[PDB]
Amino acid sequence: GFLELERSSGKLEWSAILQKMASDLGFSKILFGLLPKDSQDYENAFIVGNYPAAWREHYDRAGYARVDPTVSHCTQSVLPIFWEPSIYQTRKQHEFFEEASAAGLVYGLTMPLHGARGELGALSLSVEAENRAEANRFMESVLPTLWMLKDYALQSGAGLAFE
Amino acid sequence: GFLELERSSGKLEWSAILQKMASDLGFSKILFGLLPKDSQDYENAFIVGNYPAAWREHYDRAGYARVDPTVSHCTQSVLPIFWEPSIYQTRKQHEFFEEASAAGLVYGLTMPLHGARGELGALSLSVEAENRAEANRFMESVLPTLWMLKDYALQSGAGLAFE
Numbered sequence: 546g547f548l549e550l551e552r553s554s555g556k557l558e559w560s561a562i563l564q565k566m567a568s569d570l571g572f573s574k575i576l577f578g579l580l581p582k583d584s585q586d587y588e589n590a591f592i593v594g595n596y597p598a599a600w601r602e603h604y605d606r607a608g609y610a611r612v613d614p615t616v617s618h619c620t621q622s623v624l625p626i627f628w629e630p631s632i633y634q635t636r637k638q639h640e641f642f643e644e645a646s647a648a649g650l651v652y653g654l655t656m657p658l659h660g661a662r663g664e665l666g667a668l669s670l671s672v673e674a675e676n677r678a679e680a681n682r683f684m685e686s687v688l689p690t691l692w693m694l695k696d697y698a699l700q701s702g703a704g705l706a707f708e
Numbered sequence: 709g710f711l712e713l714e715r716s717s718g719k720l721e722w723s724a725i726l727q728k729m730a731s732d733l734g735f736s737k738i739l740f741g742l743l744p745k746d747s748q749d750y751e752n753a754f755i756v757g758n759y760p761a762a763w764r765e766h767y768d769r770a771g772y773a774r775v776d777p778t779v780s781h782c783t784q785s786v787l788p789i790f791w792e793p794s795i796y797q798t799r800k801q802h803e804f805f806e807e808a809s810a811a812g813l814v815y816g817l818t819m820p821l822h823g824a825r826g827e828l829g830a831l832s833l834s835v836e837a838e839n840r841a842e843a844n845r846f847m848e849s850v851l852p853t854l855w856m857l858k859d860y861a862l863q864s865g866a867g868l869a870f871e
């Protein structure tokens with residue numbers, strides 16, 4: 546089932562299959578980001594998903610890559626970071642949280658990606674939920690499936706992005 | 709469950725916890741092996757588990773690291789490789805399979821590990837079964853839990869090994 550991603554014929558079908566897998570699990574918004582080994586910026590970044598255009602533009606223009614707490618987490622860990630109040634420590638980090646929320650992205654998680662050739666990225670997914678308790682229950686129900694998905698997405702996406 | 713790995717202090721206790729987690733999922737023999745970023749040999753490796761000593765020594769003395777098809781796989785992929793007839797092709801590769809079988813390690817899988825700081829290794833697990841079909845059913849039944857475990861073991865184990 547997960548293998549349909551590597552079996553996908555091209556970037557278009559991969560991105561579509563990834564978004565549909567996420568959708569079927571219950572996540573209506575996803576962003577897969579991957580950088581080649583030892584990148585100094587995002588010039589060669591492979592970024593694919595269905596996050597709103599306005600938010601993508603705003604995140605870039607505001608330089609939120611340097612504020613977003615899930616980014617530094619990804620450089621230090623292979624474990625998921627859940628979007629919880631505790632992760633936003635500084636005012637800048639709270640402002641990022643509010644801007645994301647205003648854009649419709651409030652509940653979710655970020656799965657770090659570390660590929661066999663030094664690729665560095667994240668798979669982020671947001672769930673449209675009523676409240677945090679509801680978000681938590683949903684995410685726990687699907688977490689083991691998502692844990693497998695992120696590595697399949699990484700292996701397949703790396704081959705598609707940089708070869 | 710998974711928190712006990714972090715909670716533990718000492719290589720002996722950590723290894724015993726991992727071994728017990730693996731056993732509970734149906735695997736009686738495991739090996740956790742981890743190398744620092746860009747290692748050029750095995751001198752600085754952290755290798756821990758309950759593989760029999762005679763097999764550990766033979767593998768080393770025979771140079772099976774350069775033959776073992778799971779080793780080259782780990783350098784190329786984040787996805788598991790099942791211990792399968794098809795991964796063996798050369799004469800030395802058939803010899804490796806035969807000797808692993810003689811040591812009682814016939815069915816299993818190797819989960820590649822790629823750490824956030826360039827750590828490289830594998831969690832390899834063997835399952836006792838009447839035949840390969842049965843072994844495959846045992847492994848598939850716990851694959852999502854194993855997928856989480858290998859990442860928890862990597863994050864925790866890298867700290868224990870190198871920090």
Ligand SMILES: O=C(Oc1c(Br)cc(Br)cc1CNC(=O)c1ccccc1[N+](=O)[O-])c1ccc(Br)cc1
Pocket residue numbers: 576577578592596600601604610613615616619620628645650655665666667669670
């Ligand atoms: O994908 C990455 O950052 C992205 C980019 Br680029 C654009 C946007 Br918009 C969002 C992210 C990742 N962050 C999130 O998805 C996120 C995390 C927590 C809360 C809210 C959000 N969010 O953007 O809605 C990224 C960058 C560097 C590294 Br290393 C890993 C991942």
Ligand SMILES: O=C(Oc1c(Br)cc(Br)cc1CNC(=O)c1ccccc1[N+](=O)[O-])c1ccc(Br)cc1
Pocket residue numbers: 739740741755759763764767773776778779782783791808813818828829830832833
């Ligand atoms: O752990 C690694 O190799 C080991 C070492 Br060292 C000693 C021994 Br004994 C075994 C391995 C890994 N291979 C296996 O466990 C294996 C794989 C397939 C079939 C049978 C076995 N086996 O050893 O029984 C390893 C080395 C390099 C990299 Br990269 C990743 C993993």
